[PDB]
DNA sequence: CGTATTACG
DNA sequence: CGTATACG
Protein backbone atom coordinates (compact mmCIF):
# COMPACT_ATOMS: atom_id res chain seq x y z
CA UNK A 1 0.00 0.00 0.00
CA UNK A 2 1.19 3.53 -0.90
CA UNK A 3 -0.03 6.51 1.26
CA UNK A 4 -0.61 9.83 -0.49
CA UNK A 5 -1.55 12.97 1.44
CA UNK A 6 -2.88 16.22 -0.12
CA UNK A 7 -2.89 19.50 1.74
CA UNK A 8 -3.69 23.08 0.77
CA UNK A 9 -1.28 24.57 3.32
CA UNK A 10 -2.13 28.27 2.59
CA UNK A 11 1.53 29.29 2.86
CA UNK A 12 4.36 26.69 3.11
CA UNK A 13 6.55 29.12 5.07
CA UNK A 14 3.60 29.67 7.46
CA UNK A 15 2.96 25.98 8.13
CA UNK A 16 6.70 25.46 8.56
CA UNK A 17 6.64 28.02 11.40
CA UNK A 18 3.76 26.08 12.93
CA UNK A 19 5.45 22.65 12.89
CA UNK A 20 4.88 21.29 9.38
CA UNK A 21 8.05 19.18 9.51
CA UNK A 22 7.11 17.62 12.87
CA UNK A 23 3.72 16.62 11.40
CA UNK A 24 5.34 15.45 8.16
CA UNK A 25 7.79 13.17 10.00
CA UNK A 26 5.01 11.68 12.20
CA UNK A 27 2.58 11.02 9.30
CA UNK A 28 5.24 9.46 7.00
CA UNK A 29 3.40 9.63 3.67
CA UNK A 30 4.88 7.98 0.63
CA UNK A 31 3.84 10.98 -1.43
CA UNK A 32 2.84 14.42 -0.17
CA UNK A 33 1.09 16.92 -2.47
CA UNK A 34 0.78 20.54 -1.38
CA UNK A 35 -1.27 23.38 -2.83
CA UNK A 36 -1.09 27.17 -2.29
CA UNK A 37 2.56 27.20 -1.15
CA UNK A 38 2.87 30.97 -1.79
CA UNK A 39 6.61 30.56 -2.42
CA UNK A 40 9.32 29.76 -4.96
CA UNK A 41 12.07 27.30 -3.87
CA UNK A 42 14.63 30.07 -3.34
CA UNK A 43 12.46 31.61 -0.58
CA UNK A 44 12.27 28.33 1.31
CA UNK A 45 14.53 27.32 4.20
CA UNK A 46 16.93 24.44 3.44
CA UNK A 47 15.13 22.17 5.90
CA UNK A 48 11.98 22.68 3.81
CA UNK A 49 13.63 21.98 0.43
CA UNK A 50 15.68 19.01 1.71
CA UNK A 51 13.57 16.61 3.75
CA UNK A 52 15.20 13.33 4.76
CA UNK A 53 14.13 10.42 2.51
CA UNK A 54 12.11 12.51 0.04
CA UNK A 55 12.74 14.06 -3.34
CA UNK A 56 11.03 17.47 -3.55
CA UNK A 57 9.49 19.30 -6.53
CA UNK A 58 8.33 22.91 -6.45
CA UNK A 59 6.15 24.50 -9.14
CA UNK A 60 5.70 28.19 -8.27
CA UNK A 61 3.53 30.79 -9.92
CA UNK A 62 5.19 33.52 -11.98
CA UNK A 63 3.73 36.01 -9.50
CA UNK A 64 5.83 36.23 -6.31
CA UNK A 65 4.17 34.83 -3.14
CA UNK A 66 1.07 33.67 -5.04
CA UNK A 67 -0.39 30.17 -5.53
CA UNK A 68 2.24 27.43 -6.14
CA UNK A 69 2.20 23.66 -5.66
CA UNK A 70 4.77 21.19 -4.34
CA UNK A 71 5.33 17.43 -4.16
CA UNK A 72 7.58 15.39 -1.88
CA UNK A 73 8.05 11.71 -2.67
CA UNK A 74 9.98 8.70 -1.32
CA UNK A 75 10.28 7.19 -4.83
CA UNK A 76 10.88 9.69 -7.62
CA UNK A 77 8.64 9.76 -10.69
CA UNK A 78 9.89 8.84 -14.17
CA UNK A 79 8.57 12.24 -15.29
CA UNK A 80 6.94 15.44 -14.02
CA UNK A 81 4.93 17.76 -16.25
CA UNK A 82 3.96 21.24 -15.00
CA UNK A 83 1.06 22.24 -17.21
CA UNK A 84 -1.62 21.37 -19.74
CA UNK A 85 0.19 23.01 -22.67
CA UNK A 86 -1.89 26.18 -22.36
CA UNK A 87 0.09 29.29 -21.27
CA UNK A 88 -2.63 31.03 -19.21
CA UNK A 89 -3.18 27.86 -17.12
CA UNK A 90 0.43 26.84 -16.84
CA UNK A 91 1.96 29.97 -15.29
CA UNK A 92 -0.04 30.17 -12.03
CA UNK A 93 1.82 27.38 -10.25
CA UNK A 94 -1.31 25.19 -10.24
CA UNK A 95 -0.23 21.92 -11.92
CA UNK A 96 2.03 18.98 -11.27
CA UNK A 97 1.52 15.71 -13.17
CA UNK A 98 3.94 13.08 -11.94
CA UNK A 99 4.42 9.69 -13.59
CA UNK A 100 4.76 6.88 -11.10
CA UNK A 101 4.35 4.11 -13.77
CA UNK A 102 1.46 2.33 -12.01
CA UNK A 103 -0.31 5.69 -12.25
CA UNK A 104 -0.09 9.37 -13.07
CA UNK A 105 -0.53 11.67 -10.10
CA UNK A 106 -2.24 15.00 -10.81
CA UNK A 107 -1.55 17.48 -8.00
CA UNK A 108 -3.82 20.42 -8.83
CA UNK A 109 -4.64 23.70 -7.19
CA UNK A 110 -7.89 24.62 -8.95
CA UNK A 111 -8.68 28.37 -9.28
CA UNK A 112 -10.91 30.21 -6.83
CA UNK A 113 -13.83 32.06 -8.47
CA UNK A 114 -14.96 34.29 -5.60
CA UNK A 115 -13.09 37.50 -6.36
CA UNK A 116 -14.54 38.30 -9.79
CA UNK A 117 -16.55 37.15 -12.80
CA UNK A 118 -13.34 36.92 -14.87
CA UNK A 119 -11.83 34.61 -12.24
CA UNK A 120 -14.97 32.45 -12.14
CA UNK A 121 -14.60 32.19 -15.97
CA UNK A 122 -10.88 31.34 -15.61
CA UNK A 123 -11.86 28.66 -13.01
CA UNK A 124 -14.43 27.02 -15.32
CA UNK A 125 -12.07 27.09 -18.34
CA UNK A 126 -9.29 25.60 -16.15
CA UNK A 127 -11.76 22.82 -15.21
CA UNK A 128 -12.27 22.14 -18.95
CA UNK A 129 -8.59 22.22 -19.77
CA UNK A 130 -7.98 19.80 -16.88
CA UNK A 131 -10.66 17.40 -18.06
CA UNK A 132 -9.28 17.36 -21.64
CA UNK A 133 -5.77 16.50 -20.38
CA UNK A 134 -6.78 13.80 -17.93
CA UNK A 135 -9.11 12.14 -20.47
CA UNK A 136 -6.29 12.09 -23.07
CA UNK A 137 -4.15 10.12 -20.60
CA UNK A 138 -6.89 7.82 -19.29
CA UNK A 139 -7.89 6.98 -22.89
CA UNK A 140 -4.31 6.01 -23.68
CA UNK A 141 -4.67 3.35 -20.97
CA UNK A 142 -3.13 5.22 -18.02
CA UNK A 143 -4.57 4.97 -14.54
CA UNK A 144 -4.74 8.37 -12.87
CA UNK A 145 -4.96 9.74 -9.31
CA UNK A 146 -6.04 13.41 -8.91
CA UNK A 147 -5.79 15.36 -5.66
CA UNK A 148 -5.91 18.93 -4.63
CA UNK A 149 -8.16 21.83 -3.88
CA UNK A 150 -11.06 21.79 -6.41
CA UNK A 151 -12.52 24.91 -4.73
CA UNK A 152 -16.06 23.54 -5.05
CA UNK A 153 -18.35 21.54 -2.78
CA UNK A 154 -20.04 18.92 -4.97
CA UNK A 155 -23.38 18.31 -3.24
CA UNK A 156 -25.39 19.68 -0.29
CA UNK A 157 -23.87 17.12 2.08
CA UNK A 158 -20.47 18.68 1.26
CA UNK A 159 -20.97 21.98 3.20
CA UNK A 160 -22.70 23.04 6.45
CA UNK A 161 -24.73 25.87 4.84
CA UNK A 162 -25.84 24.76 1.35
CA UNK A 163 -28.83 27.13 1.20
CA UNK A 164 -26.97 30.33 1.99
CA UNK A 165 -24.28 29.57 -0.60
CA UNK A 166 -26.38 28.85 -3.70
CA UNK A 167 -25.00 32.04 -5.31
CA UNK A 168 -21.45 31.93 -3.87
CA UNK A 169 -18.55 30.63 -6.01
CA UNK A 170 -17.74 27.24 -4.55
CA UNK A 171 -21.34 26.08 -4.51
CA UNK A 172 -22.70 27.56 -7.78
CA UNK A 173 -24.94 25.27 -9.89
CA UNK A 174 -22.48 25.66 -12.83
CA UNK A 175 -19.53 24.57 -10.68
CA UNK A 176 -21.39 21.62 -9.10
CA UNK A 177 -22.43 20.58 -12.60
CA UNK A 178 -18.79 20.50 -13.74
CA UNK A 179 -18.03 18.00 -10.96
CA UNK A 180 -21.08 15.88 -11.98
CA UNK A 181 -19.67 15.92 -15.52
CA UNK A 182 -16.19 15.05 -14.33
CA UNK A 183 -17.57 12.07 -12.47
CA UNK A 184 -19.76 11.03 -15.43
CA UNK A 185 -16.57 11.05 -17.56
CA UNK A 186 -15.39 7.94 -15.65
CA UNK A 187 -13.95 9.22 -12.34
CA UNK A 188 -14.74 8.46 -8.71
CA UNK A 189 -14.76 10.80 -5.71
CA UNK A 190 -12.83 8.40 -3.44
CA UNK A 191 -13.93 9.77 -0.05
CA UNK A 192 -17.58 8.90 -0.90
CA UNK A 193 -16.56 5.27 -1.58
CA UNK A 194 -16.06 4.83 2.18
CA UNK A 195 -18.04 7.54 3.95
CA UNK A 196 -21.54 8.84 3.24
CA UNK A 197 -21.80 10.95 6.45
CA UNK A 198 -22.53 14.66 6.58
CA UNK A 199 -20.32 17.09 8.52
CA UNK A 200 -17.18 15.87 6.70
CA UNK A 201 -15.28 18.98 5.58
CA UNK A 202 -11.76 20.03 4.60
CA UNK A 203 -12.00 23.85 4.75
CA UNK A 204 -13.39 26.32 7.29
CA UNK A 205 -13.34 30.10 7.08
CA UNK A 206 -10.83 31.78 9.40
CA UNK A 207 -12.98 34.94 9.49
CA UNK A 208 -15.95 33.61 11.46
CA UNK A 209 -14.12 31.04 13.62
CA UNK A 210 -15.95 28.39 11.62
CA UNK A 211 -13.65 25.45 12.44
CA UNK A 212 -14.48 25.20 16.17
CA UNK A 213 -18.16 24.94 15.21
CA UNK A 214 -17.37 22.67 12.22
CA UNK A 215 -19.04 25.03 9.77
CA UNK A 216 -17.01 23.77 6.84
CA UNK A 217 -16.98 22.79 3.21
CA UNK A 218 -15.43 19.77 1.49
CA UNK A 219 -13.22 21.41 -1.15
CA UNK A 220 -10.29 18.95 -1.24
CA UNK A 221 -10.64 15.59 -3.02
CA UNK A 222 -8.90 12.46 -4.26
CA UNK A 223 -10.39 11.16 -7.52
CA UNK A 224 -9.36 8.08 -9.52
CA UNK A 225 -10.41 6.80 -12.95
CA UNK A 226 -13.12 4.16 -12.45
CA UNK A 227 -10.96 1.35 -13.92
CA UNK A 228 -8.52 1.94 -11.06
CA UNK A 229 -11.02 2.26 -8.22
CA UNK A 230 -10.48 -1.34 -7.01
CA UNK A 231 -6.94 -0.35 -5.97
CA UNK A 232 -8.18 2.37 -3.55
CA UNK A 233 -7.99 0.96 0.01
CA UNK A 234 -8.78 4.12 2.00
CA UNK A 235 -9.75 7.76 1.48
CA UNK A 236 -10.02 9.95 4.53
CA UNK A 237 -9.84 13.46 6.01
CA UNK A 238 -7.15 14.37 8.55
CA UNK A 239 -9.64 16.63 10.42
CA UNK A 240 -7.42 17.32 13.40
CA UNK A 241 -4.28 18.52 11.64
CA UNK A 242 -4.15 22.29 12.21
CA UNK A 243 -2.02 25.05 10.72
CA UNK A 244 -4.06 25.99 7.61
CA UNK A 245 -7.70 26.84 6.88
CA UNK A 246 -7.77 23.48 5.01
CA UNK A 247 -6.92 20.16 6.68
CA UNK A 248 -4.96 17.35 4.86
CA UNK A 249 -6.74 14.51 3.06
CA UNK A 250 -5.39 10.98 2.60
CA UNK A 251 -5.41 8.09 0.13
CA UNK A 252 -4.11 4.52 0.48
CA UNK A 253 -3.54 2.89 -2.91
CA UNK A 254 -2.60 -0.76 -3.52
CA UNK A 255 0.42 -1.01 -5.86
CA UNK B 1 -3.16 71.02 40.52
CA UNK B 2 -0.63 68.32 39.50
CA UNK B 3 -0.93 67.48 35.77
CA UNK B 4 0.54 64.23 34.35
CA UNK B 5 1.50 64.07 30.63
CA UNK B 6 2.66 60.83 29.05
CA UNK B 7 4.30 60.62 25.57
CA UNK B 8 4.69 57.37 23.66
CA UNK B 9 5.81 56.46 20.18
CA UNK B 10 3.46 53.48 19.82
CA UNK B 11 4.62 52.24 16.43
CA UNK B 12 1.08 51.36 15.30
CA UNK B 13 -1.85 52.38 17.47
CA UNK B 14 -3.93 49.45 16.20
CA UNK B 15 -1.04 47.16 17.18
CA UNK B 16 -0.78 48.46 20.76
CA UNK B 17 -4.63 48.28 21.02
CA UNK B 18 -4.42 44.57 20.18
CA UNK B 19 -1.79 44.19 22.92
CA UNK B 20 -3.77 45.88 25.69
CA UNK B 21 -3.25 49.64 25.25
CA UNK B 22 -6.64 50.59 26.78
CA UNK B 23 -5.92 48.58 29.96
CA UNK B 24 -2.54 50.30 30.36
CA UNK B 25 -4.14 53.71 29.62
CA UNK B 26 -6.82 53.26 32.27
CA UNK B 27 -4.17 52.21 34.83
CA UNK B 28 -1.88 55.16 34.15
CA UNK B 29 -4.69 57.76 33.77
CA UNK B 30 -2.63 60.67 32.63
CA UNK B 31 -4.24 64.07 32.25
CA UNK B 32 -2.85 64.14 28.72
CA UNK B 33 -1.52 61.30 26.52
CA UNK B 34 0.53 62.15 23.42
CA UNK B 35 1.17 59.38 20.89
CA UNK B 36 3.50 59.30 17.86
CA UNK B 37 3.67 56.96 14.87
CA UNK B 38 0.05 55.78 15.16
CA UNK B 39 0.07 54.54 11.51
CA UNK B 40 -3.67 55.09 11.25
CA UNK B 41 -6.48 57.48 10.44
CA UNK B 42 -9.53 57.75 12.76
CA UNK B 43 -11.72 55.76 10.32
CA UNK B 44 -9.35 52.79 10.79
CA UNK B 45 -9.83 52.76 14.56
CA UNK B 46 -12.64 51.09 16.53
CA UNK B 47 -15.12 53.41 18.20
CA UNK B 48 -13.80 52.47 21.67
CA UNK B 49 -10.31 53.54 20.64
CA UNK B 50 -11.57 56.84 19.20
CA UNK B 51 -13.66 57.63 22.23
CA UNK B 52 -12.14 56.70 25.58
CA UNK B 53 -14.40 57.56 28.49
CA UNK B 54 -13.24 60.80 30.19
CA UNK B 55 -11.01 61.92 27.30
CA UNK B 56 -11.31 63.97 24.18
CA UNK B 57 -9.18 62.59 21.30
CA UNK B 58 -7.50 64.38 18.39
CA UNK B 59 -5.99 62.36 15.57
CA UNK B 60 -3.59 63.88 13.05
CA UNK B 61 -2.83 61.16 10.43
CA UNK B 62 -0.35 61.50 7.54
CA UNK B 63 -1.70 61.91 4.01
CA UNK B 64 0.00 58.53 3.28
CA UNK B 65 -2.12 55.59 4.52
CA UNK B 66 -0.74 53.71 7.56
CA UNK B 67 2.37 55.91 7.78
CA UNK B 68 3.46 58.22 10.62
CA UNK B 69 0.58 60.11 12.30
CA UNK B 70 0.21 61.54 15.85
CA UNK B 71 -2.70 61.61 18.31
CA UNK B 72 -3.56 63.20 21.63
CA UNK B 73 -6.08 62.24 24.31
CA UNK B 74 -6.90 64.80 26.98
CA UNK B 75 -9.37 65.04 29.88
CA UNK B 76 -9.67 68.80 29.37
CA UNK B 77 -9.83 69.80 25.72
CA UNK B 78 -7.49 72.46 24.40
CA UNK B 79 -8.85 75.83 23.31
CA UNK B 80 -7.17 75.27 19.91
CA UNK B 81 -5.10 72.69 18.02
CA UNK B 82 -2.72 73.54 15.18
CA UNK B 83 -1.54 70.65 12.98
CA UNK B 84 1.41 72.23 11.21
CA UNK B 85 4.13 74.90 11.01
CA UNK B 86 2.69 76.41 7.83
CA UNK B 87 5.14 74.59 5.55
CA UNK B 88 3.48 72.09 3.29
CA UNK B 89 6.10 69.32 3.11
CA UNK B 90 6.40 69.26 6.93
CA UNK B 91 2.64 69.51 7.54
CA UNK B 92 1.36 66.61 5.46
CA UNK B 93 3.19 63.78 7.18
CA UNK B 94 1.02 63.64 10.31
CA UNK B 95 3.89 64.77 12.55
CA UNK B 96 2.61 67.90 14.30
CA UNK B 97 0.03 68.77 16.98
CA UNK B 98 0.33 72.08 18.87
CA UNK B 99 -2.40 72.24 21.48
CA UNK B 100 -3.25 75.30 23.58
CA UNK B 101 -4.06 74.49 27.20
CA UNK B 102 -3.92 78.22 28.13
CA UNK B 103 -1.33 77.76 30.85
CA UNK B 104 1.01 76.38 28.20
CA UNK B 105 1.13 75.17 24.60
CA UNK B 106 1.85 71.44 24.21
CA UNK B 107 3.80 70.39 21.07
CA UNK B 108 3.38 66.66 20.34
CA UNK B 109 5.88 66.03 17.56
CA UNK B 110 7.00 62.93 15.70
CA UNK B 111 10.33 64.19 14.30
CA UNK B 112 11.51 62.50 11.08
CA UNK B 113 13.87 59.56 10.89
CA UNK B 114 16.94 60.25 8.73
CA UNK B 115 18.35 56.74 8.39
CA UNK B 116 16.79 55.79 5.08
CA UNK B 117 18.44 58.33 2.74
CA UNK B 118 20.33 61.63 2.46
CA UNK B 119 17.06 63.10 1.18
CA UNK B 120 15.34 62.07 4.42
CA UNK B 121 18.24 63.23 6.62
CA UNK B 122 18.00 66.65 4.93
CA UNK B 123 14.22 66.52 5.48
CA UNK B 124 14.76 65.76 9.23
CA UNK B 125 17.26 68.58 9.60
CA UNK B 126 15.01 71.10 7.80
CA UNK B 127 12.07 69.93 9.97
CA UNK B 128 14.25 70.63 13.03
CA UNK B 129 14.86 74.15 11.65
CA UNK B 130 11.15 74.82 11.01
CA UNK B 131 10.23 73.43 14.47
CA UNK B 132 12.71 75.80 16.19
CA UNK B 133 11.35 78.86 14.36
CA UNK B 134 7.84 77.85 15.41
CA UNK B 135 8.42 77.20 19.05
CA UNK B 136 10.60 80.33 19.32
CA UNK B 137 7.85 82.49 17.82
CA UNK B 138 5.29 81.18 20.37
CA UNK B 139 7.71 81.43 23.31
CA UNK B 140 8.80 84.93 22.22
CA UNK B 141 5.14 85.97 22.15
CA UNK B 142 4.93 85.15 25.88
CA UNK B 143 3.84 81.51 25.93
CA UNK B 144 5.20 78.76 28.04
CA UNK B 145 5.75 75.63 26.01
CA UNK B 146 6.07 71.89 26.63
CA UNK B 147 7.48 69.83 23.78
CA UNK B 148 7.27 66.03 23.77
CA UNK B 149 7.76 63.22 21.32
CA UNK B 150 10.22 61.24 19.34
CA UNK B 151 13.17 63.52 18.38
CA UNK B 152 14.86 60.57 16.66
CA UNK B 153 18.30 61.69 18.02
CA UNK B 154 20.21 60.75 21.19
CA UNK B 155 21.69 64.00 22.50
CA UNK B 156 24.98 62.98 24.22
CA UNK B 157 27.11 59.83 24.50
CA UNK B 158 25.29 58.99 27.77
CA UNK B 159 22.05 58.81 25.73
CA UNK B 160 22.87 55.59 23.88
CA UNK B 161 24.59 52.25 24.68
CA UNK B 162 26.95 52.40 21.64
CA UNK B 163 28.00 56.04 20.92
CA UNK B 164 31.23 55.20 19.03
CA UNK B 165 29.77 52.77 16.45
CA UNK B 166 26.92 55.19 15.74
CA UNK B 167 29.08 58.28 15.07
CA UNK B 168 28.08 58.12 11.40
CA UNK B 169 24.53 56.78 11.83
CA UNK B 170 21.50 59.13 11.64
CA UNK B 171 20.28 59.30 15.18
CA UNK B 172 23.75 60.18 16.50
CA UNK B 173 25.42 62.34 13.78
CA UNK B 174 27.38 65.41 14.91
CA UNK B 175 24.97 67.59 12.89
CA UNK B 176 21.90 66.19 14.74
CA UNK B 177 23.55 66.34 18.18
CA UNK B 178 24.57 69.96 17.43
CA UNK B 179 20.98 70.89 16.59
CA UNK B 180 19.81 69.63 20.02
CA UNK B 181 22.67 71.68 21.59
CA UNK B 182 21.40 74.72 19.69
CA UNK B 183 17.72 74.15 20.64
CA UNK B 184 18.84 74.07 24.33
CA UNK B 185 20.86 77.29 23.92
CA UNK B 186 17.69 78.94 22.55
CA UNK B 187 16.39 78.67 26.13
CA UNK B 188 14.98 75.16 26.58
CA UNK B 189 15.60 72.35 29.04
CA UNK B 190 15.74 68.55 28.58
CA UNK B 191 13.55 67.73 31.59
CA UNK B 192 14.68 64.15 32.16
CA UNK B 193 18.22 65.43 32.90
CA UNK B 194 16.90 67.89 35.49
CA UNK B 195 16.37 64.83 37.72
CA UNK B 196 18.37 61.91 36.34
CA UNK B 197 22.06 61.98 35.39
CA UNK B 198 22.54 58.20 35.04
CA UNK B 199 23.68 56.14 32.06
CA UNK B 200 21.51 53.26 30.77
CA UNK B 201 18.33 55.37 30.55
CA UNK B 202 16.84 54.70 27.12
CA UNK B 203 13.45 54.91 25.41
CA UNK B 204 14.01 52.91 22.19
CA UNK B 205 15.62 49.57 21.37
CA UNK B 206 15.87 47.77 18.07
CA UNK B 207 13.46 44.86 17.66
CA UNK B 208 15.83 43.19 15.17
CA UNK B 209 18.58 42.24 17.64
CA UNK B 210 16.44 41.77 20.74
CA UNK B 211 18.26 44.79 22.08
CA UNK B 212 15.71 45.64 24.80
CA UNK B 213 16.46 42.56 26.91
CA UNK B 214 20.16 43.54 26.91
CA UNK B 215 19.26 47.26 27.30
CA UNK B 216 21.20 48.20 24.20
CA UNK B 217 19.13 51.35 23.75
CA UNK B 218 18.95 54.99 22.79
CA UNK B 219 17.12 57.88 24.46
CA UNK B 220 15.10 59.28 21.51
CA UNK B 221 11.98 60.51 23.27
CA UNK B 222 12.06 63.69 25.29
CA UNK B 223 10.07 66.28 27.19
CA UNK B 224 11.45 69.83 26.89
CA UNK B 225 10.13 73.07 28.50
CA UNK B 226 11.17 76.70 27.99
CA UNK B 227 13.57 77.56 30.84
CA UNK B 228 11.16 80.08 32.41
CA UNK B 229 8.69 77.20 33.04
CA UNK B 230 11.14 74.66 34.53
CA UNK B 231 10.29 75.41 38.20
CA UNK B 232 6.82 74.00 37.43
CA UNK B 233 8.33 70.60 36.46
CA UNK B 234 8.01 68.14 39.38
CA UNK B 235 9.22 65.00 37.65
CA UNK B 236 10.29 63.58 34.31
CA UNK B 237 10.77 59.83 33.96
CA UNK B 238 10.91 56.83 31.65
CA UNK B 239 8.23 54.12 31.82
CA UNK B 240 10.68 51.43 30.85
CA UNK B 241 8.59 48.46 31.97
CA UNK B 242 5.75 49.28 29.59
CA UNK B 243 5.92 46.93 26.60
CA UNK B 244 4.13 46.81 23.25
CA UNK B 245 6.33 49.01 21.02
CA UNK B 246 10.06 49.40 20.30
CA UNK B 247 9.81 52.65 22.27
CA UNK B 248 8.62 52.87 25.88
CA UNK B 249 6.52 55.75 27.21
CA UNK B 250 7.89 58.79 28.99
CA UNK B 251 6.29 60.94 31.68
CA UNK B 252 6.14 64.51 32.91
CA UNK B 253 4.40 65.91 35.99
CA UNK B 254 3.83 69.64 36.35
CA UNK B 255 2.29 71.72 39.11
CA UNK B 256 0.38 74.83 38.24
CA UNK B 257 -0.85 77.55 40.68
C1' DC C 1 11.75 42.09 14.14
C1' DG C 2 7.37 44.08 13.52
C1' DT C 3 3.62 47.16 11.63
C1' DA C 4 1.89 49.09 8.14
C1' DT C 5 0.85 48.98 2.58
C1' DT C 6 -2.44 46.06 -1.16
C1' DA C 7 -3.96 41.35 -3.26
C1' DC C 8 -6.15 37.34 -2.56
C1' DG C 9 -8.70 33.99 -0.41
C1' DC D 1 -8.67 36.02 9.95
C1' DG D 2 -4.49 35.19 7.79
C1' DT D 3 -0.43 34.86 4.40
C1' DA D 4 1.65 36.80 1.02
C1' DT D 5 6.80 46.12 -0.46
C1' DA D 6 7.98 50.37 2.66
C1' DC D 7 9.76 52.09 6.57
C1' DG D 8 12.12 52.13 10.71
UniProtKB/Swiss-Prot annotation, chain B:
Cofactor(s) required for function per UniProt? Mg(2+)
GO function term, MF aspect, one? phosphoric diester hydrolase activity
Catalytic activity as recorded in UniProt: 2'-deoxyribonucleotide-(2'-deoxyribose 5'-phosphate)-2'-deoxyribonucleotide-DNA = a 3'-end 2'-deoxyribonucleotide-(2,3-dehydro-2,3-deoxyribose 5'-phosphate)-DNA + a 5'-end 5'-phospho-2'-deoxyribonucleoside-DNA + H(+); Exonucleolytic cleavage in the 3'- to 5'-direction to yield nucleoside 5'-phosphates
Residue positions binding Mg(2+) 1: 11, 37
Q: Which domain of life is it from?
A: Archaea
Q: Which residues form a coiled coil?
A: none
- Cofactor binding: number and manner: Can also use Mn(2+), Co(2+) and Ni(2+).
KO phenotype (gene knockout) = Depletion leads to the loss of DNA-U repair.
Q: Name one GO biological process term.
A: base-excision repair
Residues the record lists as binding Mg(2+) 2 = 150, 152, 247
Instruction: Tell me the protein family, please.
Output: Belongs to the DNA repair enzymes AP/exoA family.
Give additional notes from the record.
Answer: The insertion of the side chain of Arg-208 into the DNA helical base stack seems to be crucial for the uridine recognition.
As for what it does, the entry says: Involved in DNA uracil repair. Recognizes DNA uracil residues within double-stranded DNA and initiates DNA-U repair by endonucleotic incision on the 5'-side of the 2'-d-uridine residue, irrespective of the nature of the opposing nucleotide. In addition, acts as an apurinic/apyrimidinic (AP) endonuclease hydrolyzing the DNA phosphodiester backbone immediately at the 5'-side of AP sites, and as a 3'-5' exonuclease. Strongly binds to double-stranded DNA.
The protein, known as: DNA uridine endonuclease
